[PDB]
Every structure is written in structure tokens, then in C-alpha cells.
Design a protein around this ligand. Structure first.
Ligand code: QRZ
Ligand code: QRZ
Ligand code: PRO
Ligand code: PRO
Lengths: 256, 256
């Protein structure tokens, strides 16, 4: 097993994965903030204050009540200042012809500001081929949803294996996974894991939580994605630091 | 097998399904236009001209370059005038807590104007439970994606069976499926089938086409969803009429 800094230099590394792995190693963070907020001001205040603690900020542009492209300009300024990537959690999930238009166009112009997006693999590889027609010219990357954290997830067994094959066959654009565990044996791929809290439990709508130690240390993932464990806390900076230190130490201990 | 008009009266029918089945029978149309356009003016001009020919207009609000809620007000006026439902093809596809916010909120306020939305079943039943917390109070309906038209689709076998079970267990909100065929034996559920053209073929990004006769007549679906077969034609009204007559006669012949 290689450090994040060494993985950043692998021959087959994607440039977006390399940038991410280098800033993870530099900043000692493998935390992705899930900024599930409805106000641009709260999104930007979280990005500014927590930027030093995170490798990545995951957005849901479609729940911002006051989305504009200027908000995303201000977010990019903070991402460059504090050195983190922007990941729009769009879950592209249809035929290639449709997702190509959804990625480039409409009011959000996601490809113009998102370093990373994700896709469900259920439509077959056309979902990746369509996105890559927009994303490759713009030097973007994509994550494939290989496993899900929620009760009754169908992203298991042969579905997960199909996601891994699709990623490994589209390595010029696919840089990793949303997963609960290491699913690819190839170190060039990032594993990002949502469904993470320090305390045991879940929510009222099928979310299930595992700890940073469990998902980074035992399950071999690279990055934790944390929403409410941070966002609902009073001091979101302290909460982000607790999650960062948990995920980072779990990574160091596994690396040995 | 019951006519659309008789299915509209079934004891367990959802009110949105009943409204749809009644206007299908009244207008002799089982055609859903896939209005995959980037200009509000083109969306509204298609909705006005093709409204009499369609039971439903399927939107992708996120590819409209000039989306506003006023555009959706104008679309509702046309839907009421010409009697068709509005189906936003949002493909909700995450944990219940997230999709609840995506359905109600952000710039699109989808629940405020969409009679129908759809969801992928990959997250497990929490995707339906989250959407229904917004959709049930607003008397809306949902379609579950049980099969997909594209090459390499993973919506097969046990995945399709899980979608059918999830629909049948959430009948207060789920009114049917996106599928290639009849997948539920319960006549209260609608089957809507995309990947439809009069001519054989596909696209360059994994879309595959079957004819209205094949999917309504042989595969037992209720409604065809047609995009480019209409949208790319010079005379979109004539094209819509050809697809309407094809789907309607296939339905009549199967009913006997
Ligand atoms: N789309 C992805 S990254 C995803 C996949 C998954 O399996 N489980 C997921 O919780 N997520 C997302 O991660 C976030 C988890 O938030 P929280 O439960 O920590 O508050 C949320 O935005 C959800 O949409
Ligand atoms: N999301 C759904 S309804 C879907 C599921 C599926 O399996 N195949 C799909 O083509 N669709 C959608 O139907 C439309 C087909 O357009 P066309 O190929 O007729 O031009 C398009 O908007 C696509 O996103
Ligand atoms: O010097 C560095 O940071 C990188 C890490 C692995 C080797 N070179
Ligand atoms: O009269 C009608 O239109 C409906 C159709 C089935 C029975 N009643």
C-alpha cells in the first residue's frame, strides 16, 4: 500500500485524482464535507471556515434556494484559496445523450465549476461515455456509485462488480467510486464513503452510519463524506476537525 | 384486461393514475412527449401544438437554458388547456433525506408543478419514503425505474423484481414504472416505455429503440415515451400523430 502522496504519482493516475491526493497528503485531510444546506451564505461560510480541514466539498446545487453562477465563482475562489476540490453530487443516471446535456447545460452549467461529479451505473456504460464527451475536454473527473449506505441498497454483488469494471475500462475520466469499502484493487482509483458519523445509528429515512475508523481502517476506503455529523453540530469547525483527525489516523494506521 | 377508462376506476387506483387513464381514454392517446429541448419558447410551442396528441409531457427542467418558475406556470396552463400531465424526469436516486429536499426545494421547486416524477430504486425504499413525505401532501405520484432502454442496463432480473415490490408496497404514492415491458401484474400500475422509434436502430451513446407495436402490443406496456423520433422531425405535430396512432392501435389490438 502506497501513501496518498505516492498514489498521486502513479503512472495511470488521472490529473484530478493526482491534484486531490497531493492536497490530501499536504493538508493531512481525507475528509469531504457534504454541504447539504439551502443558503448560499451558509455554503460559502462553511467552505471558508472548514476549507483548511477538508480535501473536498460535496455540493447539492439543486437544494440551494439562491443558486447563481456567481455563488459558484465565490466557491471556486475559496476552493483555490484553501485547496480543496468541488464535487457536485448530481448522480447522473440515464442514457448518455441525456446526461451529456445535463452536465454541460441548463441553469447549473455543472461542468463549468465542478472538479468531480458522480454517476449511477444502472444505465450501462453510455452514462460514462455521455459525461466524458463534456468532461474530458474540460479536464474533469467522475466517480461511479458502486455501493450505497442506505437500507435496502441494490448496489451489491454483480452490480458493484459492474461499477468497478466500468470505472477500470474508462480510466481517462473515471477517477474512483462512491462506495462503503475498497471495491477496486487498483490504487489509482479513489474510494469515497458516505454514511459516516462518530456515533452509531442512522436516520428516519434509511441512512445507516459507520465510523471513520470502520470505513477507512477496516473497510479500506480513502475519504469520508460527512454531512449532518458536521452540519448539525453547533461548532462545525471543531466537528470537521474531529472527523478529519479520525479519518486521517485511521488511514495512517492502515498504511503502517 | 381492462381498458384505460376502466383501469381509471379500479378500487386501489391512485388519483394521479386515474386522471391520466381517463384523459388517455378520452383523447385516444398513450403518447408521452419527451420534450428534450433547451429553450423555454420551444418547450411551450411544442406543448401547445402537440398537447391534444399527448397524455403526458416529460420534462428535463435542468437542460432548459432559460428555466424560471414562470415558464412552468405557462406549461401548467397548457397542460390544463390540452389535458396532459407533466412528468419531470428527475431520476431521484439517493437516500430519503436528500431526495426529500431535492423534490421540494432549490430553484426548480419540482413538487410545485410536476404531477409525476421518477426515481431509481438502487438506494432502497428510503428513496420512495423521502419523496412521499413531500409528494403525498401535494397529491403527486411517482414512477419507479424498473428497466432501462440502454446497452448494458443493470435494471434486470432481481433489480427489476425489487422495483416492482417497492412500487406495490408504496401504492399510496407510486403509480407505475419506467420499464421496457409490463413488469407488474397489478392493473392499477402504469407502464411507461422510453427507447421508442418507428424505425429500428439506436444512438451513438447506448440508446436502443423498439417500435410502438413491439412495446405496447407484444411487451404489454401502456405508454410510449418518444423524444428525438418527434423532436428531430421537421413537422413535430405530424410525427406526434404518427406515434399516437401507432401506440393507440397497438393498445386496442392487445385489448381485443
Ligand atoms: N450521493 C452520495 S455521495 C451518497 C451515496 C450514498 O450511498 N449515501 C449517501 O449518504 N450519499 C450522500 O452523502 C450525504 C450523507 O449525508 P449525512 O447522512 O452525513 O448527513 C448526503 O448528501 C447523501 O446524499
Ligand atoms: N428517464 C427515462 S424516462 C429514460 C429511461 C430509459 O431507460 N431510457 C430513456 O431513454 N429515458 C429517457 O427517455 C428519453 C428518450 O429520448 P429519445 O431517445 O426518444 O430521444 C430521454 O429523455 C431519456 O432520458
Ligand atoms: O515528495 C512527495 O511529497 C511525494 C510523495 C511520494 C514521493 N514524492
Ligand atoms: O364511462 C366511462 O368512460 C368509464 C369507462 C369504464 C366504465 N366507465
Amino acid at each position: 500500500e502506497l501513501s496518498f502522496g505516492a498514489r498521486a504519482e502513479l503512472p495511470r493516475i488521472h490529473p484530478v485524482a493526482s491534484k486531490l491526493l497531493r492536497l490530501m497528503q499536504k493538508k493531512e485531510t481525507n475528509l469531504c464535507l457534504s454541504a447539504d444546506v439551502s443558503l448560499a451564505r451558509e455554503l460559502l461560510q462553511l467552505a471558508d471556515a472548514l476549507g483548511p480541514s477538508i480535501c473536498m466539498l460535496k455540493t447539492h446545487v439543486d437544494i440551494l434556494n439562491d443558486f447563481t453562477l456567481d455563488v459558484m465563482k465565490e466557491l471556486i475562489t475559496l476552493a483555490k484559496c484553501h485547496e480543496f476540490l468541488i464535487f457536485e453530487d448530481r448522480k447522473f443516471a440515464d442514457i448518455g445523450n441525456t446526461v451529456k446535456k445535463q452536465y454541460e447545460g441548463g441553469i447549473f452549467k455543472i461542468a463549468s465549476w465542478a472538479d468531480l461529479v458522480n454517476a449511477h451505473v444502472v444505465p450501462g456504460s453510455g452514462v460514462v461515455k455521455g459525461l466524458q464527451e463534456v468532461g474530458l475536454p474540460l479536464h474533469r473527473g467522475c466517480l461511479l456509485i458502486a455501493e450505497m449506505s442506505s437500507t435496502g441498497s441494490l448496489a451489491t454483488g454483480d452490480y458493484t462488480r459492474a461499477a468497478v469494471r466500468m470505472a477500470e475500462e474508462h480510466s481517462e475520466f473515471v477517477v474512483g467510486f462512491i462506495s462503503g469499502s475498497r471495491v477496486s484493487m487498483k490504487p489509482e482509483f479513489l474510494h469515497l464513503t458516505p454514511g459516516v458519523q462518530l456515533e452509531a445509528g442512522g436516520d428516519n429515512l434509511g441512512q445507516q452510519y459507520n465510523s471513520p475508523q470502520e470505513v477507512i481502517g477496516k473497510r479500506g476506503s480513502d475519504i469520508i463524506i460527512v454531512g449532518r455529523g458536521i452540519i448539525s453540530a453547533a461548532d462545525r469547525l471543531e466537528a470537521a476537525e474531529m472527523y478529519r483527525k479520525a479519518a486521517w489516523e485511521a488511514y495512517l494506521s492502515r498504511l503502517g
